[PDB]
């Protein structure tokens, strides 16, 4: 399941069965279809689902559109998050780890208007491609790398006005900087077929708690998270829970312990709003019994 396939699942939804099909837009659409990262095949520029797929890609690529197309995009976007969450629900319920994680990233992508391959710095206000090129050239790749710089370094690199920096500071102070700690409950008493309980604790270290900053997403959004346990080797999604976080939160996940012996898993913490904030921890358990 590639990003392309996930975008197709979202745009093929019955919810978009009535996206406006206009006289005289085929031109823009035909060209749009030429420029988007994932080219479409038979394109039927009369299919609301085809239009929806192109407008979603255009949004992710932050391309120039007509006022009308921009309005159509806003409509599509207003239904997108809920659809993506449902998609994550389906993929994770079926136990498909990679597809489920990719769908979670798609929620971040749609919110921040960017592709999974883009630098996380594309989220910062006023950051252009050259900003990103210069940051990458310098080995600066995370928002945290940006925040660690002193003024002289930052001004030379970003070349931003005091007002632009104030906007950057606002985003950085709300960007998730969470400390995740976890405990395998009674690690020495796990029995085959019995429960394996993982107690996760989250604590926000950044200064501001509040709604997501996403200049290119029309609706007000709240920060959402998923905590997941899976087997990366077999691509199996074992446990998942959705949560919202204020200052501190405790999340309990559990799953059936496999056959006696040593086993390895991965604990994931995934955003549905920001990129670059996800965490992964490979842990192990010793199952007794037998």
UniProtKB/TrEMBL annotation:
SMART domains the UniProt entry points to: Sec63
Membrane-spanning parts: none
Cellular localisation: Endoplasmic reticulum; Membrane
Record InterPro entries: C2_domain_sf (IPR035892), Ig_E-set (IPR014756), Sec63-dom (IPR004179)
Keyword flag DNA-binding: no
Mode of membrane association: Multi-pass membrane protein
Name of protein: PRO2281
Domain SEC63: 1-285
Lineage: Eukaryota, Metazoa, Chordata, Craniata, Vertebrata
GO cellular component annotations of the record: endoplasmic reticulum; membrane
Keywords, alphabetical: Chaperone, Endoplasmic reticulum, Membrane, Transmembrane, Transmembrane helix
Keyword Ribosomal protein attached: no
């Amino acid at each position: 399941t590639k990003v392309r396939g996930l975008i197709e699942i979202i745009s093929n939804a019955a919810e978009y069965e009535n996206i406006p099909i206009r006289h005289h837009e085929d031109n823009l659409l035909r060209q749009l279809a030429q420029k988007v990262p994932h080219k479409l095949n038979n394109p039927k520029f009369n299919d609301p689902h085809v239009k929806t797929n192109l407008l979603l890609q255009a949004h992710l690529s932050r391309m120039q559109l007509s006022a009308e197309l921009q309005s159509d995009t806003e409509e599509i976007l207003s239904k997108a998050i809920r659809l993506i969450q449902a998609c994550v629900d389906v993929l994770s319920s079926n136990g498909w780890l990679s597809p489920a994680l990719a769908a979670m990233e798609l929620a971040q992508m749609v919110t921040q208007a960017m592709w999974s391959k883009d630098s996380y710095l594309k989220q910062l206000p006023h950051f252009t491609s050259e900003h990103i090129k210069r940051c990458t050239d310098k080995g600066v790749e995370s928002v945290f790398d940006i925040m660690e710089m002193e003024d002289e370094e930052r001004n030379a690199l970003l070349q931003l006005t005091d007002s632009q920096i104030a906007d950057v500071a606002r985003f950085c102070n709300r960007y998730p900087n969470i400390e995740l700690s976890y405990e395998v409950v009674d690690k020495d008493s796990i029995r085959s077929g019995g429960p394996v309980v993982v107690l996760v604790q989250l604590e926000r270290e950044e200064e501001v708690t509040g709604p997501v900053i996403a200049p290119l997403f029309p609706q007000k959004r709240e920060e959402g998270w998923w905590v997941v346990i899976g087997d990366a080797k077999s691509n199996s999604l074992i446990s998942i829970k959705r949560l919202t976080l204020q200052q501190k939160a405790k999340v309990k996940l559990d799953f059936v312990a496999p056959a006696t012996g040593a086993h390895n898993y991965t604990l994931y913490f995934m955003s549905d709003a920001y990129m670059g904030c996800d965490q992964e921890y490979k842990f192990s358990v010793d199952v007794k019994e037998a």
